[PDB]
Amino acid sequence: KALRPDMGYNTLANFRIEKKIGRGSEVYRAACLLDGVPVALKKVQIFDLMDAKARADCIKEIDLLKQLNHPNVIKYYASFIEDNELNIVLELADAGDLSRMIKHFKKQKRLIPERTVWKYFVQLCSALEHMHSRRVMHRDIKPANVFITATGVVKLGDLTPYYMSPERIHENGYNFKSDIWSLGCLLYEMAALQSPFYMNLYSLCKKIEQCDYPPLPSDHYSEELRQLVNMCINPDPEKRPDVTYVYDVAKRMHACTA
Ligand code: NI
């Protein structure tokens, strides 16, 4: 339809869809016509798959997400109902992700150097500390959801889970410490090019309660990095550190490995 300038990013009429870039919700690359800014436009059929209650929860959650504002977190520009669908307008992160980065290293048959691990991990910690400071849980930390722009800037992405924390396996509540568990698994994965517990939930539970994951090599990864992983993936959420402590370690290690 026709441009509605008063409406900012809150109406489909102010965007030109350029391409479908994802599906399964459907995701389009679009441009905001008011300012030429590129966006990801996600269309969710919340009336064909969502209960009255889940709809309010999902919406209240998106409203909390829109208040976020950080260079390392994907910006939620807007969300609105139109054409009987939920439309979420997101910062476009198009150039790649941590999952792809790890694949490059696997293909070149080499490990990610420690300094490179901290270079990206510290930015991820910055994102997550912003979120936790705003009292928002991420809930889906995984390499494919950690975008990396073309200039190597980390963008923590929009919210059978990739990393299953013990409390989630047994259907306890997801909380801030569950984010820390995924963050620890991710750090391990950057260093090992494989998830720590790479099956079924019962054998997964067994391995977790017995730290049955292969140690990282001490000749490539410092005690600092290895201990930080170890504490973040403690089975007991009370034993895991808060994001503020993880972030502080990341910043110290980034500063002296560079
Ligand atoms: Ni169990």
Author numbering: 20 to 43, 46 to 180, 199 to 237, 241 to 300
Task: Copy text from the publication.
We determined the atomic structure of Nek7 and discovered an autoinhibited conformation that suggests a regulatory mechanism not previously described in kinases. In both structures, a tyrosine side chain points into the active site, interacts with the activation loop, and blocks the αC helix.
We crystallized the apo-form, full-length (35 kDa) human Nek7 protein and determined the structure to 2.1 Å. The overall conformation is that of an inactive kinase with the αC helix, DLG motif, and activation loop displaced from the usual configuration observed in active enzymes. The most striking feature of the structure is the position of Tyr97, which juts from between β4 and αC into the active site of Nek7 and forms an H-bond between its hydroxyl and the backbone amide of Leu180 within the DLG motif. The DLG motif is in an inactive conformation, perhaps held by this H-bond. The aromatic ring of Tyr97 is sandwiched between the gatekeeper residue Leu111 and Leu86. In the Nek7 structure, αC is positioned outwards and twisted away so that the salt bridge between Lys63 and Glu82 cannot form. Therefore, the conformational change required to move from the Tyr-down to the Tyr-up conformation in Nek7 is more substantial than just the rotation of the Tyr side chain and would require a concerted set of movements around β4 and αC.
